[PDB]
Amino acid sequence: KLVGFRFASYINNYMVLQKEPAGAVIWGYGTSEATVTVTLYRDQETIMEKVTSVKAHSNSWMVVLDPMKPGGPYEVMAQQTFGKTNFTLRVHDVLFGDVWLCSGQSNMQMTVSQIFNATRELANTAAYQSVRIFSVSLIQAEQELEDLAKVDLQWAKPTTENLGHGIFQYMSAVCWLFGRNLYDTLQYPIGLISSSWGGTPIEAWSSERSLKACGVPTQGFTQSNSVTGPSNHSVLWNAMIHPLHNMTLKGVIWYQGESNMNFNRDLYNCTFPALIEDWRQTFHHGSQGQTERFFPFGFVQLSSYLSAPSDDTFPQIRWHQTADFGYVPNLRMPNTFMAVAMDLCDRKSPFGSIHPRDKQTVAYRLHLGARAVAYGEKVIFQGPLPEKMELLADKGLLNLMYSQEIQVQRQDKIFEISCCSDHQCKWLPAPMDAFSAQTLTLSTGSCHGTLAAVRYAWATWPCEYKQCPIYHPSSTLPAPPFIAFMT
Ligand SMILES: *[C@@H]1O[C@H](CO[C@@H]2O[C@@H](C)[C@@H](O)[C@@H](O)[C@@H]2O)[C@@H](O[C@@H]2O[C@H](CO)[C@@H](O[C@@H]3O[C@H](CO[C@H]4O[C@H](CO)[C@@H](O)[C@H](O)[C@@H]4O)[C@@H](O)[C@H](O[C@H]4O[C@H](CO)[C@@H](O)[C@H](O)[C@@H]4O)[C@@H]3O)[C@H](O)[C@H]2NC(C)=O)[C@H](O)[C@H]1NC(C)=O
Ligand SMILES: *[C@@H]1O[C@H](CO)[C@@H](O[C@@H]2O[C@H](CO)[C@@H](O[C@@H]3O[C@H](CO)[C@@H](O)[C@H](O[C@H]4O[C@H](CO)[C@@H](O)[C@H](O)[C@@H]4O)[C@@H]3O)[C@H](O)[C@H]2NC(C)=O)[C@H](O)[C@H]1NC(C)=O
Ligand SMILES: *[C@@H]1O[C@H](CO)[C@@H](O[C@@H]2O[C@H](CO)[C@@H](O[C@@H]3O[C@H](CO)[C@@H](O)[C@H](O)[C@@H]3O)[C@H](O)[C@H]2NC(C)=O)[C@H](O)[C@H]1NC(C)=O
Ligand SMILES: *[C@@H]1O[C@H](CO)[C@@H](O[C@@H]2O[C@H](CO)[C@@H](O)[C@H](O)[C@H]2NC(C)=O)[C@H](O)[C@H]1NC(C)=O
Ligand SMILES: *[C@@H]1O[C@H](CO)[C@@H](O)[C@H](O)[C@H]1NC(C)=O
């Protein structure tokens, strides 16, 4: 059995390895029982060394480096000794910093060349040479893969050519812009790994464990107009995520759910929290405990598209993305953060309205949540949501008391109330009647019955671009959609 001495496929020139307090995992393949010495250099000087042996059967080897301050460059060498043989592997331009994995479906996959202001965005790289980029090839596998089968974009300094290399190819716009925003704040190296595929349901990205935890039914024939990518359970976890699970990382950002609009829709409130938890457990263990057990996990609540009037699948998914709380983090989704995108619509996208071109605001909103949840900063990252409600049935009023200050444009249809009479309920629009800094009063007088619930922005396309009715007055964040039941 002759096994080449090689690094795992996440290791390359120009890469970013996770910084202190974590140790960075370095692993590869080689000859059974050979000794592998991994050395970190700064030019010719030795910074640290780790020694291990190649395991029989798997022919794999692994070390965990001591924690490193962010920065660089460094070189990593691995040297295998077996009898009198001596082979060496070397990578250079290695940095230490925060490694973020970006995944999901086509609004993660959409690249910098596809977005608004693309020419200027593609040109803005000289200040960001320490924001290193990587993109995983579109591969599916019936079993978990130990190593990536193929890499589309190996670790690289960002350029016009590799940020905008092809339509839905690389580099992910949301991922790049998120990292660019992180660099502005952090001023130390950022590594970005994009691993996404259009038209894919969450089940494709989930291991068997999270699917079983949620009671997901066995697959039938799942391709439909809204599921155009790989849809067999776990096949993208298996090939495009699992091979990264031993690599130490900082967190994940995620943009997916469009393809669950008609595929296990009513389970998404389980399957998405369960994906987060299973990725966390699996990466924590694969990385020898170095990746945080509750590593921060950020996501984009679905944007809009120009749909049929009857369709309220997207509002349901948006709600389920928060585990039906309306906000994250929450009791079922610790250390998570969300960007609202329903107001970031695009009627004229050449990629279809499902692919809106403003990824800049998506990445800005994500980065606020990362600053708060992933970095501990006291920064506003959630939009205004009611904390309490007061029904004044005799006056025909419903007061909503918000979490934060509100800036409200008059809009008499954005809120609806569920009006129950004669053993049936109907949703009716609820006009805005009165305002104070944190309380909005709705009129319920058109309901000649009992009020069971209220909802806000519960439509596939609730508003025109950056024209939703309620924002915070200064954070720029929109009020998220919600439903609330009366007691
Ligand atoms: C296992 O291999 C280790 C890695 O070496 C590679 O793999 C092996 C199998 C060989 O094929 C080898 O050619 C590969 O480089 C090996 O460690 C390496 O060993 C070499 C050989 O001793 C070291 O290179 C020599 O370094 C000295 C010192 O260099 C310093 O000082 C000089 C002089 O002031 C400066 O000019 C340099 O910039 C450095 O600061 C050099 O003097 C010497 O040069 C002479 O020989 C070479 C050919 O070898 C000629 O081309 C030159 O013109 C000179 O005539 C070498 O360059 C190397 O530093 C070392 N690397 C490390 C990381 O330690 C190791 O010994 C092997 N281990 C085992 C267990 O067998
Ligand atoms: C189209 O794309 C271009 C290229 O991305 C974009 O221009 C850039 O806009 C940003 C603002 O988003 C400019 O950022 C400033 O740049 C200066 C000088 O380099 C910095 O000193 C500024 O720092 C402040 O702001 C940061 C947060 O943004 C903070 O982290 C920092 O502490 C400071 O407070 C700031 O980064 C940038 O200079 C230009 N770049 C170029 C090359 O023009 C343009 O806005 C885009 N337009 C649209 C309509 O999307
Ligand atoms: C990347 O991480 C995975 C874990 O997610 C590593 O697989 C795990 O490898 C460990 C250590 O070799 C295995 O543990 C051993 O199990 C045997 C039982 O056969 C036990 O007797 C040993 O004492 C030890 O505990 C573990 O089973 C295995 N886990 C899974 C889920 O496969 C993997 O090796 C890592 N990759 C590399 C290249 O190291
Ligand atoms: C996920 O969302 C679904 C759909 O809203 C929830 O299922 C509803 O839950 C109530 C309470 O058990 C039932 O009375 C409804 O009939 C259910 N509707 C459907 C269509 O099944 C479900 O409880 C949510 N699960 C989680 C974990 O939040
Ligand atoms: C999906 O799973 C089915 C059933 O096991 C299998 O026959 C099929 O080849 C798989 N599809 C792809 C695209 O691999």
XYZ file of C-alpha atoms and ligand atoms in Angstrom:
689
model
C 0.000 0.000 0.000
C 1.769 3.126 -1.301
C 0.237 6.401 -0.053
C 1.602 9.745 -1.115
C 2.708 12.227 1.523
C 0.308 15.121 0.999
C -1.607 17.791 2.838
C -5.390 17.845 3.155
C -6.990 19.979 0.498
C -7.770 22.988 2.717
C -3.988 23.557 3.114
C -2.293 25.672 0.499
C -0.130 28.656 -0.208
C -1.839 31.927 0.806
C -4.179 30.257 3.282
C -5.468 31.585 6.591
C -5.280 29.388 9.678
C -7.391 30.110 12.766
C -5.742 32.351 15.363
C -5.441 32.177 19.141
C -6.867 31.106 21.499
C -7.511 28.109 19.247
C -4.801 25.896 17.830
C -4.783 25.338 14.101
C -5.167 21.757 12.885
C -2.844 20.592 10.099
C -3.527 17.129 8.647
C -2.697 15.031 5.622
C -1.821 11.600 4.271
C 1.369 9.552 4.216
C 3.032 6.218 4.802
C 1.732 4.171 7.709
C 3.867 4.525 10.870
C 6.053 7.232 9.354
C 7.007 10.176 11.544
C 5.696 13.541 10.393
C 7.266 16.752 11.711
C 5.315 19.939 11.067
C 7.245 23.165 11.455
C 6.029 26.753 11.367
C 8.682 29.138 10.042
C 9.120 32.864 9.683
C 11.527 32.820 6.715
C 14.316 30.678 7.983
C 13.487 30.893 11.718
C 11.624 28.105 13.508
C 8.548 29.302 15.394
C 7.160 25.950 16.509
C 7.322 22.265 15.723
C 4.882 19.384 16.231
C 5.615 15.686 15.712
C 3.193 12.857 15.083
C 2.935 9.451 13.389
C 0.876 8.374 10.370
C -2.011 6.147 11.353
C -2.419 2.682 9.873
C -5.547 1.966 7.872
C -6.423 5.638 7.253
C -2.869 6.590 6.303
C -3.615 9.975 7.831
C -1.627 12.204 10.150
C -2.615 15.243 12.193
C -1.057 17.861 14.445
C -2.512 20.823 16.334
C -0.322 23.906 16.312
C 0.108 26.043 19.397
C -2.141 29.123 19.340
C -0.843 31.995 17.226
C -1.297 35.747 17.297
C -2.941 36.930 14.083
C -0.731 38.042 11.272
C 2.054 36.647 9.121
C 3.292 35.666 6.675
C 4.591 32.287 7.781
C 5.583 29.097 6.032
C 4.360 25.648 7.089
C 6.535 22.650 6.271
C 5.696 19.025 6.884
C 8.462 16.440 6.688
C 7.917 12.690 6.627
C 10.647 10.311 7.765
C 10.267 6.598 7.115
C 13.498 4.661 7.409
C 15.988 6.538 5.245
C 13.348 8.336 3.177
C 12.712 12.048 3.747
C 9.950 13.909 1.929
C 8.901 17.532 2.442
C 5.794 19.590 1.770
C 5.786 23.379 2.050
C 3.225 26.152 1.859
C 4.017 29.860 2.052
C 2.233 33.154 2.583
C 0.283 31.579 5.437
C -1.578 33.950 7.751
C -3.287 33.519 11.082
C -6.653 35.123 11.590
C -10.378 34.283 11.515
C -11.577 31.591 9.119
C -15.214 31.860 8.041
C -17.101 29.240 6.051
C -19.841 30.596 3.766
C -22.494 28.182 2.549
C -26.013 27.769 1.207
C -27.754 28.081 -2.133
C -27.643 30.529 -5.021
C -27.733 33.837 -3.103
C -24.515 32.733 -1.421
C -23.206 31.414 -4.730
C -23.861 34.694 -6.632
C -20.456 36.268 -7.307
C -18.973 39.746 -7.109
C -19.247 40.213 -10.887
C -23.052 39.855 -10.624
C -23.844 42.525 -8.031
C -24.601 46.225 -8.177
C -21.533 48.428 -8.643
C -19.572 45.345 -9.696
C -16.804 47.178 -11.545
C -15.891 49.253 -8.530
C -16.333 46.408 -6.078
C -14.054 44.179 -8.125
C -11.405 46.936 -8.140
C -11.426 47.362 -4.328
C -8.823 44.796 -3.340
C -5.567 46.605 -2.603
C -6.505 47.281 1.039
C -7.758 43.713 1.497
C -4.855 41.504 0.445
C -5.077 39.749 3.845
C -8.689 38.722 3.151
C -7.821 35.398 1.529
C -10.386 33.538 -0.550
C -11.163 29.930 -1.423
C -14.045 28.240 -3.217
C -15.132 24.619 -3.135
C -16.013 22.820 -6.379
C -19.575 21.619 -6.941
C -19.297 17.943 -6.043
C -21.846 15.593 -4.519
C -21.087 12.287 -2.825
C -23.129 9.403 -1.546
C -20.858 9.007 1.493
C -18.939 11.459 3.629
C -15.616 12.345 2.056
C -12.510 12.695 4.197
C -10.977 15.294 1.865
C -12.347 17.644 -0.754
C -12.491 16.022 -4.172
C -11.864 19.280 -6.024
C -11.242 22.948 -5.277
C -12.462 25.575 -7.750
C -10.418 28.476 -6.280
C -7.438 27.602 -4.133
C -6.458 30.044 -1.418
C -5.548 33.343 -2.976
C -5.047 37.006 -2.498
C -8.140 38.705 -3.947
C -7.975 40.207 -7.429
C -10.431 41.539 -9.986
C -10.034 38.280 -11.876
C -10.740 35.848 -9.059
C -13.471 37.827 -7.307
C -15.399 38.068 -10.563
C -14.406 34.898 -12.331
C -17.785 33.718 -13.553
C -21.528 33.886 -13.140
C -22.397 31.769 -10.109
C -18.788 30.479 -10.204
C -16.542 32.321 -7.706
C -16.169 34.423 -5.651
C -19.321 34.625 -3.559
C -20.342 38.257 -3.133
C -22.019 37.901 0.263
C -18.973 35.977 1.505
C -16.374 38.403 0.096
C -18.240 41.492 1.289
C -18.758 40.009 4.736
C -15.078 39.382 5.060
C -14.186 42.789 3.692
C -16.413 44.371 6.335
C -14.863 42.164 9.030
C -11.403 43.256 7.936
C -12.366 46.915 8.231
C -13.309 46.288 11.871
C -10.711 43.707 12.886
C -7.630 44.742 10.895
C -6.155 41.239 10.929
C -6.299 38.387 8.416
C -9.596 36.854 7.360
C -9.965 33.596 5.470
C -13.131 33.013 3.447
C -14.180 29.587 2.216
C -17.228 29.501 -0.045
C -19.089 26.222 -0.396
C -22.537 26.692 -1.973
C -24.719 25.341 -4.732
C -27.829 26.856 -6.266
C -31.232 25.245 -5.992
C -30.427 23.042 -2.999
C -32.566 22.201 0.028
C -31.142 22.190 3.532
C -31.410 18.391 3.603
C -28.576 18.207 1.067
C -26.321 20.142 3.465
C -27.292 18.178 6.572
C -25.683 15.056 7.991
C -27.805 12.055 8.753
C -27.800 13.062 12.415
C -29.684 16.331 12.087
C -32.136 14.795 9.614
C -32.880 11.971 12.047
C -33.226 14.431 14.934
C -36.009 16.195 13.068
C -37.818 13.132 11.780
C -37.226 14.118 8.157
C -39.016 11.689 5.832
C -37.132 9.438 3.510
C -36.529 11.026 0.173
C -38.843 10.407 -2.756
C -38.465 12.312 -6.042
C -37.619 15.823 -4.863
C -36.705 17.803 -8.003
C -39.305 20.489 -8.691
C -39.298 24.016 -10.063
C -37.808 25.288 -6.797
C -35.316 22.416 -6.265
C -32.879 22.424 -9.231
C -29.627 21.395 -7.532
C -28.632 18.233 -5.691
C -31.387 17.209 -3.355
C -30.526 13.758 -2.048
C -30.072 13.836 1.695
C -26.593 14.769 2.893
C -24.832 14.629 -0.491
C -23.452 18.181 -0.201
C -22.633 17.825 3.490
C -20.801 14.685 2.440
C -18.613 16.247 -0.251
C -18.514 20.009 0.303
C -18.654 20.529 4.109
C -17.613 17.364 5.922
C -14.066 17.393 4.440
C -13.484 20.734 6.214
C -14.682 19.566 9.617
C -11.223 18.950 11.124
C -10.008 22.458 10.131
C -10.181 24.951 12.966
C -12.559 27.803 12.183
C -14.181 30.898 13.593
C -17.735 30.599 12.272
C -20.180 30.138 9.443
C -22.412 32.383 7.435
C -25.282 30.880 5.543
C -27.800 31.937 2.880
C -30.329 29.228 2.115
C -33.963 28.320 2.293
C -35.530 29.264 -1.019
C -35.453 25.598 -2.048
C -37.342 24.563 1.096
C -40.388 26.622 0.117
C -42.140 23.392 -0.916
C -39.815 20.751 0.510
C -40.245 19.856 4.159
C -41.266 23.485 4.691
C -42.996 22.832 8.003
C -39.871 21.043 9.336
C -37.459 23.901 8.550
C -37.942 25.331 12.059
C -36.325 22.077 13.246
C -33.927 21.221 10.453
C -32.167 24.581 10.425
C -31.414 24.755 14.197
C -30.463 21.090 14.008
C -28.036 21.739 11.132
C -26.392 24.492 13.163
C -26.052 22.264 16.190
C -24.747 19.265 14.232
C -22.209 21.306 12.301
C -21.043 22.736 15.644
C -20.700 19.340 17.321
C -19.017 17.778 14.313
C -16.538 20.601 13.675
C -15.779 20.923 17.395
C -14.876 17.245 17.585
C -13.092 17.019 14.232
C -10.844 19.940 15.139
C -9.733 18.282 18.368
C -11.841 20.733 20.329
C -10.274 23.815 18.750
C -13.323 25.152 16.915
C -15.731 26.580 19.491
C -18.449 24.168 20.518
C -21.048 26.931 19.970
C -19.213 28.703 17.185
C -21.099 31.757 15.843
C -23.435 30.954 12.967
C -24.909 33.773 10.901
C -27.583 33.610 8.227
C -29.656 35.678 5.813
C -33.422 35.651 6.261
C -34.865 35.164 2.801
C -35.197 38.101 0.453
C -38.139 38.440 -1.899
C -38.976 37.525 -5.463
C -41.865 38.286 -7.765
C -44.225 35.407 -6.914
C -47.836 34.509 -7.275
C -50.179 36.375 -4.939
C -51.366 33.254 -3.185
C -47.834 32.138 -2.279
C -46.853 32.592 1.415
C -44.207 29.935 1.538
C -41.409 32.503 1.801
C -42.981 34.204 4.874
C -43.218 30.788 6.485
C -39.587 29.971 5.794
C -38.463 33.390 7.056
C -40.257 32.668 10.320
C -38.848 29.141 10.541
C -35.337 30.499 9.950
C -35.629 31.989 13.422
C -37.046 28.792 14.895
C -40.368 30.695 14.987
C -39.137 33.338 17.445
C -38.715 36.221 14.996
C -35.192 36.993 16.205
C -31.851 35.334 16.841
C -30.085 34.447 19.032
C -32.826 32.650 20.854
C -33.368 29.716 23.213
C -33.066 27.151 20.384
C -30.396 28.965 18.367
C -27.631 30.136 20.675
C -24.859 32.324 19.276
C -26.614 32.946 15.992
C -27.177 36.177 14.073
C -29.422 37.122 11.159
C -29.560 39.685 8.393
C -33.048 40.647 7.236
C -33.191 40.833 3.445
C -36.890 41.166 2.584
C -36.420 44.883 1.856
C -33.409 44.267 -0.385
C -35.497 43.327 -3.450
C -34.616 43.823 -7.085
C -37.312 43.955 -9.736
C -34.874 44.091 -12.676
C -32.102 41.635 -11.788
C -30.806 39.937 -14.945
C -30.540 36.797 -12.836
C -34.204 36.992 -11.891
C -35.799 38.739 -8.922
C -34.917 35.694 -6.822
C -31.266 36.869 -7.213
C -31.264 40.503 -6.100
C -28.122 42.433 -6.818
C -27.685 44.321 -3.540
C -25.417 41.964 -1.629
C -23.615 44.908 -0.027
C -26.443 45.569 2.430
C -26.788 41.847 3.144
C -23.120 41.630 4.070
C -23.291 44.879 6.088
C -26.232 43.587 8.101
C -24.524 40.215 8.613
C -21.346 41.896 9.804
C -23.240 43.852 12.482
C -24.504 40.559 13.897
C -21.039 39.069 13.708
C -19.605 42.033 15.568
C -22.162 41.541 18.360
C -22.445 37.750 18.541
C -19.082 36.569 17.225
C -16.915 39.360 18.640
C -18.823 40.570 21.728
C -19.261 44.176 20.611
C -22.165 46.269 21.946
C -23.593 47.112 18.552
C -27.192 47.075 17.347
C -27.777 44.124 15.029
C -31.511 43.313 15.453
C -34.365 45.328 13.962
C -37.362 46.563 15.984
C -39.754 43.801 17.075
C -42.740 44.049 19.438
C -41.941 42.952 22.996
C -45.518 43.193 24.153
C -48.959 43.902 22.822
C -52.100 45.362 24.367
C -55.511 44.697 22.866
C -58.075 47.424 23.629
C -61.137 45.675 22.239
C -63.597 48.315 23.470
C -61.691 51.062 21.623
C -60.961 48.981 18.568
C -57.205 49.368 19.017
C -54.154 47.134 19.222
C -50.964 48.596 20.708
C -47.572 47.125 19.795
C -44.760 48.041 22.188
C -41.402 47.741 20.489
C -37.994 46.628 21.653
C -36.319 49.725 20.253
C -37.255 53.062 18.725
C -39.175 52.960 15.480
C -39.343 55.098 12.356
C -42.702 54.443 10.744
C -44.016 55.300 7.310
C -47.825 55.234 7.121
C -48.801 51.932 5.504
C -52.276 50.573 6.231
C -51.809 47.062 4.794
C -48.399 45.929 6.111
C -50.017 44.706 9.315
C -52.855 42.228 9.266
C -55.073 40.907 12.046
C -56.800 37.548 12.220
C -60.470 38.233 12.832
C -62.611 35.366 14.051
C -66.384 35.304 13.891
C -69.027 32.648 13.301
C -66.436 29.903 13.714
C -64.138 31.133 10.944
C -61.122 33.443 10.875
C -59.896 35.797 8.149
C -56.847 38.023 7.857
C -57.737 41.702 7.465
C -55.452 44.713 6.988
C -54.943 46.797 10.112
C -54.495 50.536 9.537
C -51.945 52.494 11.559
C -53.813 54.842 13.904
C -51.296 56.445 16.248
C -47.601 56.609 17.054
C -45.186 57.198 19.819
C -41.416 56.570 20.038
C -41.816 52.841 20.845
C -45.577 52.141 20.592
C -47.534 51.757 17.381
C -51.325 51.705 17.578
C -53.289 49.747 14.984
C -57.002 50.104 14.329
C -58.954 46.866 14.632
C -62.431 48.327 14.083
C -62.884 46.489 10.801
C -62.874 43.264 12.801
C -66.379 42.471 13.984
C -65.379 39.489 16.006
C -62.441 38.399 18.122
C -58.818 39.102 17.333
C -56.697 35.937 17.304
C -53.370 37.149 15.939
C -51.447 39.965 14.280
C -48.746 39.721 11.624
C -46.364 42.151 9.920
C -44.777 42.032 6.477
C -46.193 38.538 5.930
C -45.818 38.505 2.166
C -43.274 37.212 -0.299
C -42.652 40.765 -1.530
C -43.642 43.011 1.404
C -42.074 46.250 0.186
C -40.099 48.026 -2.441
C -36.332 48.360 -2.082
C -35.406 49.850 1.312
C -38.990 51.061 1.634
C -40.414 48.769 4.254
C -42.636 50.713 6.615
C -40.675 50.322 9.842
C -36.952 50.822 10.459
C -34.975 51.770 13.490
C -34.385 55.546 13.221
C -30.578 55.251 13.025
C -29.295 51.641 12.821
C -30.674 51.327 9.268
C -32.201 47.962 10.187
C -35.733 47.043 9.155
C -38.309 45.694 11.502
C -38.366 41.910 10.866
C -41.520 40.101 9.778
C -43.480 38.421 12.533
C -46.661 36.757 13.657
C -47.959 36.971 17.226
C -50.987 35.203 18.711
C -53.241 36.819 21.217
C -53.731 35.190 24.594
C 15.469 15.911 5.404
O 15.465 16.884 4.412
C 15.424 18.196 4.981
C 14.906 19.139 3.926
O 15.808 19.270 2.843
C 15.156 18.980 1.600
O 14.903 17.575 1.415
C 16.108 16.711 1.372
C 15.656 15.243 1.189
C 17.159 17.189 0.300
O 16.750 16.857 -1.037
C 17.409 18.708 0.452
O 18.151 19.122 -0.707
C 16.115 19.532 0.555
O 16.473 20.898 0.844
C 16.824 18.483 5.477
O 16.933 19.816 5.959
C 17.684 20.642 5.043
O 18.993 20.168 4.829
C 19.703 20.964 3.870
C 21.008 20.251 3.592
O 21.866 20.300 4.725
C 19.875 22.390 4.402
O 20.400 23.159 3.326
C 21.722 23.598 3.548
O 21.701 24.699 4.384
C 23.054 25.232 4.590
C 22.824 26.361 5.560
O 21.988 27.300 4.897
C 22.021 28.514 5.628
O 23.278 29.192 5.548
C 23.778 29.466 4.214
C 25.303 29.790 4.247
O 25.725 30.940 5.030
C 22.857 30.556 3.602
O 23.381 30.858 2.254
C 21.412 30.004 3.609
O 20.476 31.003 3.179
C 20.952 29.407 4.999
O 20.861 30.514 5.923
C 23.648 25.702 3.250
O 24.988 26.134 3.400
C 23.630 24.576 2.183
O 24.037 25.144 0.914
C 25.000 24.348 0.186
O 24.423 23.124 -0.315
C 23.330 23.305 -1.308
C 22.772 21.932 -1.677
O 22.306 21.304 -0.455
C 23.867 24.116 -2.514
O 22.809 24.340 -3.455
C 24.451 25.476 -2.018
O 24.899 26.267 -3.132
C 25.559 25.267 -0.942
O 26.704 24.700 -1.608
C 22.264 23.944 2.125
O 21.370 24.885 1.486
C 18.524 22.980 4.794
O 18.660 24.207 5.503
C 17.744 22.023 5.686
N 16.403 22.532 5.919
C 15.800 22.537 7.113
C 14.404 23.093 7.134
O 16.356 22.114 8.132
C 17.103 17.553 6.645
O 18.479 17.621 7.025
C 16.731 16.091 6.368
N 16.383 15.450 7.625
C 16.650 14.180 7.902
C 16.103 13.662 9.204
O 17.326 13.484 7.145
C -18.922 50.880 -5.150
O -17.774 50.181 -4.767
C -16.747 51.001 -4.191
C -15.601 50.062 -3.888
O -15.975 49.151 -2.868
C -17.243 51.748 -2.953
O -16.208 52.655 -2.579
C -15.662 52.427 -1.278
O -16.599 52.885 -0.354
C -16.172 52.717 1.004
C -17.366 52.960 1.894
O -18.231 51.832 1.871
C -15.007 53.650 1.282
O -14.592 53.392 2.617
C -13.806 54.388 3.239
O -12.484 54.458 2.678
C -11.573 55.352 3.369
C -10.205 55.510 2.602
O -9.723 54.276 2.052
C -11.465 54.831 4.846
O -10.579 55.678 5.601
C -12.904 54.759 5.501
O -12.833 54.259 6.828
C -13.977 54.573 7.643
O -15.120 53.695 7.419
C -14.895 52.260 7.738
C -16.212 51.511 7.497
O -16.597 51.680 6.118
C -14.371 52.087 9.202
O -13.999 50.720 9.418
C -13.143 53.035 9.514
O -12.716 52.904 10.895
C -13.450 54.520 9.111
O -14.426 55.024 10.025
C -13.838 53.910 4.680
O -13.387 52.502 4.759
C -13.880 53.274 0.348
O -12.812 54.218 0.411
C -14.331 53.201 -1.109
N -13.275 52.574 -1.878
C -12.940 52.936 -3.106
C -11.792 52.179 -3.712
O -13.537 53.830 -3.705
C -18.508 52.528 -3.280
O -19.088 53.068 -2.103
C -19.534 51.609 -3.910
N -20.725 52.352 -4.274
C -21.953 51.836 -4.225
C -23.057 52.749 -4.697
O -22.163 50.682 -3.820
C -11.317 14.361 11.649
O -12.261 14.219 12.734
C -12.870 12.938 12.840
C -13.877 13.030 13.947
O -14.943 13.869 13.519
C -11.801 11.876 13.074
O -12.448 10.608 13.130
C -12.305 10.080 14.439
O -10.997 9.620 14.627
C -10.847 9.239 15.997
C -9.366 9.147 16.286
O -8.688 8.288 15.381
C -11.624 7.948 16.211
O -11.561 7.579 17.589
C -11.138 6.240 17.864
O -12.229 5.312 17.850
C -11.829 3.982 18.152
C -12.988 3.064 17.866
O -12.732 2.473 16.597
C -11.349 3.993 19.603
O -11.025 2.692 20.004
C -10.103 4.906 19.703
O -9.515 4.869 21.023
C -10.462 6.314 19.248
O -11.378 6.867 20.210
C -13.095 8.154 15.874
O -13.807 6.917 15.784
C -13.293 8.905 14.566
N -14.663 9.375 14.489
C -15.432 9.228 13.409
C -16.819 9.813 13.509
O -15.021 8.668 12.387
C -10.805 11.909 11.922
O -9.780 10.931 12.063
C -10.199 13.290 11.774
N -9.357 13.328 10.591
C -8.045 13.143 10.635
C -7.341 13.201 9.338
O -7.459 12.942 11.691
C -42.700 24.297 12.940
O -43.740 24.987 12.259
C -44.899 24.159 12.134
C -45.851 24.848 11.197
O -46.313 26.068 11.761
C -45.481 23.902 13.526
O -46.576 23.000 13.366
C -47.793 23.506 13.817
O -47.774 23.421 15.240
C -48.986 23.442 16.024
C -48.623 23.050 17.449
O -48.278 21.673 17.573
C -50.036 22.523 15.422
O -51.262 22.671 16.127
C -50.180 22.859 13.947
O -51.162 22.014 13.363
C -48.864 22.613 13.250
N -48.998 22.864 11.826
C -48.529 22.052 10.882
C -48.753 22.501 9.456
O -47.951 21.003 11.157
C -44.421 23.224 14.384
O -44.833 23.095 15.743
C -43.130 24.006 14.381
N -42.076 23.267 15.067
C -41.104 23.845 15.781
C -40.051 22.932 16.332
O -41.073 25.065 15.975
C -30.239 10.034 -5.254
O -30.608 8.854 -4.562
C -31.223 7.853 -5.394
C -31.792 6.781 -4.492
O -30.805 6.165 -3.676
C -30.186 7.334 -6.376
O -30.783 6.312 -7.173
C -29.714 8.501 -7.232
O -28.668 8.096 -8.117
C -29.242 9.699 -6.388
N -29.094 10.862 -7.252
C -27.931 11.417 -7.613
C -28.033 12.622 -8.508
O -26.847 10.987 -7.218
